[PDB]
Structure formats: C-alpha cells, structure tokens
Amino acid sequence: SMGYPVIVEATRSPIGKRNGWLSGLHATELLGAVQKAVVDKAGIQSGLHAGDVEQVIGGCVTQFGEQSNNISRVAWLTAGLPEHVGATTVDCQCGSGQQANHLIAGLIAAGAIDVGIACGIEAMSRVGLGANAGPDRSLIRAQSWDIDLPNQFEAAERIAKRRGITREDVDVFGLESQRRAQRAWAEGRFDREISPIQAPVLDEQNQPTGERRLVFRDQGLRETTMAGLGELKPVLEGGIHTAGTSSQISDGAAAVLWMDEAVARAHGLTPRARIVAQALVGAEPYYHLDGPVQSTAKVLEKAGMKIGDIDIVEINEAFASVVLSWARVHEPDMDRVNVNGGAIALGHPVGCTGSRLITTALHELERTDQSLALITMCAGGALSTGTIIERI
Amino acid sequence: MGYPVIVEATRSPIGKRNGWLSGLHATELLGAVQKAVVDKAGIQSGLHAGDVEQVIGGCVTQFGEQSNNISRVAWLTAGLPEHVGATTVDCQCGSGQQANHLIAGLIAAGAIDVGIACGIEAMSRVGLGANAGPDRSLIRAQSWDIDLPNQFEAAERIAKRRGITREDVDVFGLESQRRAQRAWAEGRFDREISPIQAPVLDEQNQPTGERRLVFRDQGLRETTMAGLGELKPVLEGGIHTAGTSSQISDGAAAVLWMDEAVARAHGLTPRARIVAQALVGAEPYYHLDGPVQSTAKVLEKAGMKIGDIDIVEINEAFASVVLSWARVHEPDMDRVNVNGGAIALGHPVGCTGSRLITTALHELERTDQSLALITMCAGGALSTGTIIERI
Numbered sequence: 116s117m118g119y120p121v122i123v124e125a126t127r128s129p130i131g132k133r134n135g136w137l138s139g140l141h142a143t144e145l146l147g148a149v150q151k152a153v154v155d156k157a158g159i160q161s162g163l164h165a166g167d168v169e170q171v172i173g174g175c176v177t178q179f180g181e182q183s184n185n186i187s188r189v190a191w192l193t194a195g196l197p198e199h200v201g202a203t204t205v206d207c208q209c210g211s212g213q214q215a216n217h218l219i220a221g222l223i224a225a226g227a228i229d230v231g232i233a234c235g236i237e238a239m240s241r242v243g244l245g246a247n248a249g250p251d252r253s254l255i256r257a258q259s260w261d262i263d264l265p266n267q268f269e270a271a272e273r274i275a276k277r278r279g280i281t282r283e284d285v286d287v288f289g290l291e292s293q294r295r296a297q298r299a300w301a302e303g304r305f306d307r308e309i310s311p312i313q314a315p316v317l318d319e320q321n322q323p324t325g326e327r328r329l330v331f332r333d334q335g336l337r338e339t340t341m342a343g344l345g346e347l348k349p350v351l352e353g354g355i356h357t358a359g360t361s362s363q364i365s366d367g368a369a370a371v372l373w374m375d376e377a378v379a380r381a382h383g384l385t386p387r388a389r390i391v392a393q394a395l396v397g398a399e400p401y402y403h404l405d406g407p408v409q410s411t412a413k414v415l416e417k418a419g420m421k422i423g424d425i426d427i428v429e430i431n432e433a434f435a436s437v438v439l440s441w442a443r444v445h446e447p448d449m450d451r452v453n454v455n456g457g458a459i460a461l462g463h464p465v466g467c468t469g470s471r472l473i474t475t476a477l478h479e480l481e482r483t484d485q486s487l488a489l490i491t492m493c494a495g496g497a498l499s500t501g502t503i504i505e506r507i
Numbered sequence: 508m509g510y511p512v513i514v515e516a517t518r519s520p521i522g523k524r525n526g527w528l529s530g531l532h533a534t535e536l537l538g539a540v541q542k543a544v545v546d547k548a549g550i551q552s553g554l555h556a557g558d559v560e561q562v563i564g565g566c567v568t569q570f571g572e573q574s575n576n577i578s579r580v581a582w583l584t585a586g587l588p589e590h591v592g593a594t595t596v597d598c599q600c601g602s603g604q605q606a607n608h609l610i611a612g613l614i615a616a617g618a619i620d621v622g623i624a625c626g627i628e629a630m631s632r633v634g635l636g637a638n639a640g641p642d643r644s645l646i647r648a649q650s651w652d653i654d655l656p657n658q659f660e661a662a663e664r665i666a667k668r669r670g671i672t673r674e675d676v677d678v679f680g681l682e683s684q685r686r687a688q689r690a691w692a693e694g695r696f697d698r699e700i701s702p703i704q705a706p707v708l709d710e711q712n713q714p715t716g717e718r719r720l721v722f723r724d725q726g727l728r729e730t731t732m733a734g735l736g737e738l739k740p741v742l743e744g745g746i747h748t749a750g751t752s753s754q755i756s757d758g759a760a761a762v763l764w765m766d767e768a769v770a771r772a773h774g775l776t777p778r779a780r781i782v783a784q785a786l787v788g789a790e791p792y793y794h795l796d797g798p799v800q801s802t803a804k805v806l807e808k809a810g811m812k813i814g815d816i817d818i819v820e821i822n823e824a825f826a827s828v829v830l831s832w833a834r835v836h837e838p839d840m841d842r843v844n845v846n847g848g849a850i851a852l853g854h855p856v857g858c859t860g861s862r863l864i865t866t867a868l869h870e871l872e873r874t875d876q877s878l879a880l881i882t883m884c885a886g887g888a889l890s891t892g893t894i895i896e897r898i
C-alpha cells in the first residue's frame with residue numbers, strides 16, 4: 116500500500132535466569148537499554164537517530180507495577196530517548212512480542228509511519244506471573260465462564276497424551292535443546308544479535324554488592340544428560356514435563372527496527388527481511404497451547420507455501436510436548452527446528468520472546484545464507500502467533 | 508493489499524462510577540459490545556462473528572478483571588468463536604483510538620480482511636492505580652528525572668500556559684452538559700448506542716437478581732454557572748473541579764473494520780476511512796497538551812487545515828486541555844464536541860478512543876458532512892489523532 120515494511124536491525128539482551136544476571140535492573144531500564152541499542156546498531160553510517168523513530172510498540176504480559184502504565188513509553192523516556200516518539204504496549208500473552216512486530220509492519224504498510232520499533236520485555240524476577248491479579252484468580256473471569264481452559268502445565272500433559280508423547284520423548288527433546296544452545300554459544304552464533312547490558316550484581320539474597328557487569332551471555336545453559344533429565348520430578352503428579360523440559364523463567368528484552376523500504380534505502384541500510392505472511396489465531400481451549408498447529412497452517416496458506424519451503428523454524432519451547440505435537444502434525448525436518456536451541460535451554464521472558472525469536476531466526480538465515488523462516492508461538496488464552504519472514 | 512473502512516460502530520451507554528453498569532464484570536461489558544457490533548453487520552448481510560480475524564481492544568488498568576488480555580477473555584466470555592485472535596493494548600488514555608489505528612494497519616498490510624477495534628474500562632470494578640502497589644515511586648527507575656506531573660497538576664500547568672481562568676473552564680463545562688443534554692433530547696445518540704443488560708445492585712453493592720436494559724448515559728445533570736461556581740477545586744489554588752473534569756465511568760465501544768472490496772462483497776456499505784492517523788509523544792512538563800501535536804501531525808499528513816474539518820471530537824479529560832488546543836488551532840467551537848464530551852458523558856478511559864470515533868462518525872452521518880478529527884491527550888505524555896472521511 117502506502118508503505119513497504121522491512122527489518123533493518125534486530126537485537127536482544129542476553130537472557131538472565133530468575134534472580135540472576137539481569138535481576139538488578141528495573142524492568143524499564145532493561146527495555147530502555149535494548150530500545151536504545153537497536154537504534155545505535157544502525158550506526159553512524161546510517162545517519163539514523165532515535166528521534167527518527169515515529170512509534171514503538173512493545174509486548175509485555177504481566178503489566179503490573181514496574182511493568183504497568185505503558186512500559187514501552189516509560190522505558191523509552193527512562194533511557195533518555197526523545198519525547199516526541201509515540202509508544203504503545205500490547206498483550207496477547209505469550210505472543211505479545213511477535214504481534215508487536217506484526218503491528219509495526221501494519222502501521223508502515225498503512226503509511227501511518229516510516230520508521231518503527233517492535234520490542235518485548237519481561238522482567239520476571241521483578242514482576243512474576245500472576246502479579247496482575249489478586250490472590251483469588253477465580254474473580255478475573257465472569258461467573259458465567261464455562262470454557263475448559265486448563266492451566267498451562269495441565270495443557271502440556273493433555274497435548275502429550277493426545278499425541279502419544281512420552282517422558283523419554285520430551286527428555287530427548289530437552290537434551291537436544293541444551294545441546295544446540297551450547298553449540299550455538301560455542302560457535303558464537305548469537306554474537307551478532309546480542310547487545311550486552313550493564314547490570315548491577317546482586318548476591319544470593321538479592322542485595323547489591325557494589326559491582327556492575329556488562330552481561331553478554333545467556334544464563335540458562337547448563338550441563339545436561341539423559342540420566343540427569345531422568346531423575347527430575349515432574350511438575351504435576353503423573354505428568355511427563357519437568358524443569359528440564361519446560362521453558363525457564365527469565366528476564367530479557369528484544370527489539371526490531373522496521374522502516375519503509377525507500378527510507379531504509381535513503382539511509383543506505385540494507386533491507387534484511389520482510390514479512391511474507393503474519394497471523395494471530397485462536398486455538399482449541401481444551402488443549403490451550405496447541406495453537407502453533409493453527410497459526411502455522413494459517414501463514415502457510417496465506418504465503419502459498421508448505422512446510423518444506425521453510426529453511427529455519429523458531430517455535431517457542433514453552434513445553435517440549437508443544438513442539439513435538441506441532442512436529443507430528445506438520446512433519447518438519449527437525450534439523451531445521453530451533454537450530455540454536457530454544458526456551459528450555461535459553462529461557463522464556465514471556466513478553467520478550469516473540470521479538471527475540473524474530474531476531475534469532477533472522478540472524479540464522481543470514482549466517483547460513485538461507486531465505487525463509489517461520490516463527491510460531493503458543494500463548495495463554497488459547498492463541499498463537501505465526502510469521503513467515505523472507506530475507507531480501 | 509487492503510483498504511480499511513469502518514462498516515459498523517456502536518458503544519454501550521456510559522455509566523457513572525458505582526452506577527448503572529457497575530454490576531457487570533469487565534469481560535461481560537466488553538463482550539456485550541463485541542457481540543453487538545457483529546450483530547449489527549450480521550443482520551443485514553452474510554457476515555458472522557467467525558468472519559472476524561482479529562480483535563484489538565484498548566484497556567488502561569490491566570489488573571484483576573481487566574488483566575490477562577481482556578479482549579480475548581471478553582470474546583470467549585460472550586460465546587463468540589474461539590479461532591478469532593485478540594490482543595489488548597495500552598497507550599493509556601488513547602488506547603481505544605490506537606486500537607482502531609492498529610486494526611486499520613493490519614488490513615492495509617493484507618494480514619486481515621476483517622477486524623474489530625474496541626475499548627473497555629470498568630472503573631467501578633478496577634480503579635485507576637490498581638495495576639501498581641501502594642508505593643508508586645517503585646514503578647519508575649530510581650534514575651527517573653523527568654518532570655512529569657500528575658494529571659491534576661498537569662491541567663493547571665496547561666491553564667497557566669494559556670491564560671485560562673476559572674471562569675473560562677466553567678463556561679466550557681456548562682456547555683458540555685448543555686450539549687450532551689441537547690443530543691439526548693434530540694436522539695442524536697440513538698443510532699450509535701447498543702443498550703446493555705446490566706444487573707441491578709442494592710444499597711450494599713450486591714446483586715438483587717434484577718436486570719435492566721440500560722440505554723441512557725448516566726453522567727448528565729442539571730448544571731448552572733452559579734452551581735459550577737460553588738464547586739471546590741480538586742487541587743488547592745487550582746481552577747478545575749468535578750464540574751470541569753471528566754467523570755470516572757464504565758463503558759465499552761467497538762468498531763468493525765473491513766477491506767473495502769470485501770465489505771462490499773459481503774453486502775455491507777463502507778461508512779468511513781482513515782485519512783491520517785498518529786500517536787505522538789507530547790511535552791512531559793505539561794503532560795496532557797499533546798492534542799496540539801497530534802492534531803498538527805494528522806493535518807500535515809492529510810495535507811489539510813483545521814478549517815477543512817467538519818466535526819471535532821477532542822476528549823475533555825480537563826476543560827483546560829480543550830481550551831488550550833482551541834487557543835492554538837483556532838477552530839470554530841460550534842464544530843467542537845457538538846454532542847457534549849467527557850465532562851458530561853464520562854470517560855471510561857480505555858473505551859473512550861473507540862467511543863469518540865463512533866460518536867464522530869455518527870455525527871458526520873447525521874449532518875451529511877465529510878471530515879472529522881478525533882484527538883486525545885494521554886497519560887505518559889502521549890496523544891492520538893485521527894482524521895476520518897465519510898464514504
């Protein structure tokens with residue numbers, strides 16, 4: 116239409132563990148640092164400045180306290196960035212950070228803006244899941260509510276049972292998530308996409324020691340063995356998922372700089388990717404988190420593509436069974452799926468992850484000189500986001 | 508790909524705090540207006556709620572009943588199809604208006620052919636500030652050093668900037684009630700309002716079992732210049748009072764958008780399109796003077812001047828905000844908030860942006876005029892602006 120949106124830059128913090136390396140930052144400082152970082156990554160040779168950005172849209176799930184009151188705006192102001200830039204924070208639960216990209220591209224397509232930033236934040240050390248309601252969570256839905264929507268841990272089990280996924284099957288998968296994340300770090304695959312973040316050091320009681328680190332490494336990786344995974348106790352009684360086959364609670368932020376193509380060309384910025392097809396669809400409430408099956412089918416239809424066409428898949432690892440369910444339906448080549456590991460090993464700062472995945476997918480297309488990626492996430496409320504991006 | 512147009516729009520009546528709508532769960536109030544806007548298009552055409560691809564709803568205080576993506580929860584709660592995706596957005600005061608911008612963007616991009624933009628705020632049930640704990644200092648970094656006042660101090664700073672007196676705002680506040688009463692007396696709001704079934708409560712805020720169909724805005728009341736003159740200012744030394752500031756309210760609104768050619772193929776008539784949209788940052792020192800910038804931005808983008816615009820809806824958070832904007836842009840004030848505004852009709856924050864688009868469109872249609880401008884100030888020092896054009 117009146118714009119042609121392309122990604123020119125994308126960057127993410129390292130992902131910290133709960134009460135870990137980034138836990139001493141205010142949620143607004145963490146997001147602000149990455150917003151600033153993605154602008155800075157355009158370089159002096161771009162002539163682009165933060166005040167050339169027209170709008171920022173960031174995903175965030177638990178919009179309480181530090182994360183309330185439009186954190187995307189608060190962060191941007193806290194990082195010292197120019198006040199005339201508009202900002203909006205979005206919640207479609209887990210997919211927020213991905214839908215933030217979809218929305219920015221849409222405003223560029225519409226000719227409403229020429230330059231945008233899509234981002235996501237979750238400082239789960241600071242603002243934990245469920246802070247955005249009081250203790251009796253029955254109160255948050257109307258008395259008339261009668262949809263079998265399970266909690267996410269029961270959802271993963273129901274999905275495993277529906278697909279015949281076993282304890283062994285998920286352990287094998289969790290192991291390979293850690294292995295591939297450790298490969299990626301060993302080989303320096305994440306070195307382009309990461310913006311190291313200054314954070315204060317907190318001790319085991321969460322108290323400042325005085326020192327600050329520039330944090331540049333994902334915290335969630337660790338020595339993992341099948342035997343080790345075999346010993347872990349399941350989160351639910353009779354469940355198959357354990358800590359080692361579920362995403363980690365994490366702190367992180369990620370941001371993607373978008374422009375209309377002719378504005379990228381003016382700044383001499385290579386257009387790196389565009390969206391082929393995007394969606395956000397509802398899933399079956401009973402299974403809750405099997406939605407990647409539907410968002411994948413919806414983007415493949417819109418793109419006129421099949422799963423064979425896609426070079427790289429990033430499908431969030433909220434639980435092993437979610438990915439394995441998806442794969443038994445859509446039948447990918449698993450060597451193409453989460454090639455640098457996923458949330459089991461890397462962490463899942465919920466509102467960040469959808470921008471983080473777009474960042475990770477793009478850079479791996481670039482590293483391997485390939486063309487197409489598919490990004491897909493399950494999300495609370497029984498939803499799912501899907502993107503296919505193509506390198507330009 | 509797409510050419511976004513408004514095909515239907517509707518709003519609930521606006522209840523006062525602990526008033527006519529206060530017994531609805533926030534998810535039921537939004538869900539009712541989602542359903543209503545579908546039914547308005549479904550009756551005349553082949554369209555069904557499952558033809559909607561995505562819903563985007565604004566909401567400001569995303570806590571408790573309003574947490575966990577209320578747009579989605581409301582859609583399921585109303586019994587609408589589960590395959591429709593939904594997202595809730597917060598740019599504070601402008602959330603409802605930005606939800607419309609974003610739905611239009613997704614259509615332009617060809618991501619969706621049909622969507623709903625909406626907004627909700629159930630302020631009786633989830634009050635401002637519920638999305639943070641008691642110590643508000645905690646919600647900003649210790650490094651924060653921007654002079655961003657609270658909204659009440661902001662209204663005064665703006666009054667001072669513009670030479671706006673206690674008298675001037677009271678004159679405005681009066682006209683806002685008079686205009687809203689004229690609109691109600693003439694039935695101007697009859698087309699836009701979906702009446703909403705709401706539980707009746709007893710003295711102690713407990714349901715009786717009675718339900719009533721609510722169709723009237725609750726905030727209207729008999730107002731005089733003498734009466735406004737005896738009201739106490741909210742701040743010491745301030746000019747604004749309860750009679751010159753928006754009323755805390757409950758309400759929802761929803762707007763159905765389609766790609767124009769798809770709308771026609773469905774047998775629906777496109778009613779308006781967006782000429783220019785923006786969401787801009789404002790001066791933090793004044794906080795709420797942003798409608799001056801958002802108005803300038805959409806005009807520049809549209810290649811228009813203020814005198815091109817037939818009807819303006821600018822949100823009356825505080826009288827000074829509107830008077831300040833009018834002193835900068837010099838509209839004909841007979842075209843501004845012609846059916847009243849939030850002083851009289853109330854300001855369910857996350858709803859209002861969709862509610863003003865609804866009100867504006869319907870007043871373009873009622874007068875057979877072409878262009879409207881909708882502009883809001885917003886917490887965090889932001890402002891949303893839209894110019895729409897009747898088709």
Ligand SMILES: CC(=O)SCCNC(=O)CCNC(=O)[C@H](O)C(C)(C)COP(=O)(O)OP(=O)(O)OC[C@H]1O[C@@H](n2cnc3c(N)ncnc32)[C@H](O)[C@@H]1OP(=O)(O)O
Nearest residue numbers: 600658730734738741749750752753754755824884885886
């Ligand atoms: C940026 C934005 O978009 S704004 C965002 C959201 N807005 C806000 O910040 C909050 C909006 N306003 C408020 O917080 C509150 O409504 C206030 C502080 C302005 C006033 O609230 P209240 O005082 O509870 O409303 P209320 O109607 O009771 O007014 C107070 C008194 O003035 C009187 N009053 C108000 N309007 C009138 C009138 N037109 N005629 C006669 N009396 C009136 C009332 O009788 C009431 O009596 P009391 O004070 O003796 O009890």
Ligand SMILES: CC(C)(COP(=O)(O)OP(=O)(O)OC[C@H]1O[C@@H](n2cnc3c(N)ncnc32)[C@H](O)[C@@H]1OP(=O)(O)O)[C@@H](O)C(=O)NCCC(=O)NCCS
Nearest residue numbers: 209267337338339343357358359361362363364433434493
């Ligand atoms: C799954 C979950 C409950 C686990 O929480 P947790 O118990 O705090 O996890 P911890 O980090 O404390 O690890 C628990 C134990 O498992 C063991 N463990 C976990 N991963 C391991 C690995 N890769 N190798 C070896 N041992 C491992 C550890 O030994 C640890 O105990 P230890 O440190 O004393 O040895 C938590 O991560 C969570 O709730 N995740 C969210 C679920 C989700 O996916 N959400 C969906 C969003 S779409």
